[PDB]
């Protein structure tokens, strides 16, 4: 009855990701001004969740 596809969907930029980083690295924990100067036509949640995904809270485990 309900089915479903999928393809080519998409998330984020090569652009968009090196401003991200380079405005992490230069200015910090700033997202509000970083990216009203880096991605103002983007939402705040993008970046949040962006972040804690780059982030990892899990981390390295064994191998």
Same mark, same amino acid.
């Given at each position: ?5 999928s393809? @080519?969907? #998409?998330? &984020? !930029?090569?652009?968009?990701?090196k401003?991200f980083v #380079?405005?992490?690295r230069? *200015? ?5 001004? @970083?990216? $009203?100067?880096?991605? /103002?036509n $983007?939402? !705040?949640?993008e970046? @949040? !969740?962006f972040? *804690? *995904? &780059? #982030? #990892?809270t899990?981390? /390295?485990?064994?191998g």
């Amino acid at each position: 009855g309900s089915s479903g596809s999928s393809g @080519i969907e #998409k998330c &984020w !930029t090569e652009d968009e990701v090196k401003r991200f980083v #380079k405005g992490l690295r230069q *200015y910090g924990k700033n997202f509000f001004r @970083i990216r $009203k100067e880096l991605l /103002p036509n $983007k939402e !705040t949640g993008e970046l @949040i !969740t962006f972040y *804690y *995904y &780059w #982030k #990892k809270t899990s981390g /390295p485990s064994s191998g």
